[PDB]
């Protein structure tokens, strides 16, 4: 399972960078 | 809570980079013939 550890740590970091992008788009739409 | 959202998201990303460094140090020690 060492190769299974390196694959699942990367998927986790990519999923949090995507939650930051959607919050910025909601603030700027709420002002109109 | 907008300023509380940005502070807690940075803390979470730094904790995962530190788990990767400790797993690499444990592989290299276990090879010693002794």
Swiss-Prot record, chain B:
Effect of substituting residue 24 to K: Loss of antimicrobial activity against M.luteus
UniProt-reported outcome of changing residue 22 to A: No impact on antimicrobial activity against M.luteus
Region (Active core): 17-29
Recorded consequence of changing residue 9 to A: Slightly increased MIC against E.coli K12 (MIC=15 compared to MIC=5)
Tissue: Expressed in granulocytes (at protein level). Expressed by the eccrine apparatus and secreted into sweat on skin (at protein level).
Post-translational modification: Resistant to proteolytic degradation in solution, and when bound to both zwitterionic (mimicking mammalian membranes) and negatively charged membranes (mimicking bacterial membranes).
Function field: Antimicrobial peptide that is an integral component of the innate immune system. Binds to bacterial lipopolysaccharides (LPS). Causes membrane permeabilization by forming transmembrane pores (in vitro). Causes lysis of E.coli. Exhibits antimicrobial activity against Gram-negative bacteria such as P.aeruginosa, S.typhimurium, E.aerogenes, E.coli and P.syringae, Gram-positive bacteria such as L.monocytogenes, S.epidermidis, S.pyogenes and S.aureus, as well as vancomycin-resistant enterococci (in vitro).
Domains: entry comment: Undergoes conformational change in the presence of lipid A, transitioning from a random coil to an alpha-helical structure. Residues 17-29 of LL-37 represent the active core of the antimicrobial peptide. Forms ribbon-like fibrils and exhibits antibacterial activity against Gram-positive M.luteus (MIC=22-25 uM) and S.hominis (MIC=39 uM). Also exhibits antibacterial activity against Gram-negative E.coli (MIC=47 uM) and P.fluorescens (MIC=136 uM).
Complexes and interactors: Monomer, homodimer or homotrimer (in vitro). Oligomerizes as tetra- or hexamer in solution (in vitro).
Record's protein name: Antibacterial peptide LL-37
The organism of origin for this protein: Homo sapiens
Residues of the full protein shown: 134 to 167 of 170
């Amino acid at each position: 399972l060492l190769g299974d550890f390196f694959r699942k740590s990367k998927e986790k970091i990519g999923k949090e960078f995507k939650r930051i992008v959607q919050r910025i788009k909601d603030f700027l739409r709420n002002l109109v």
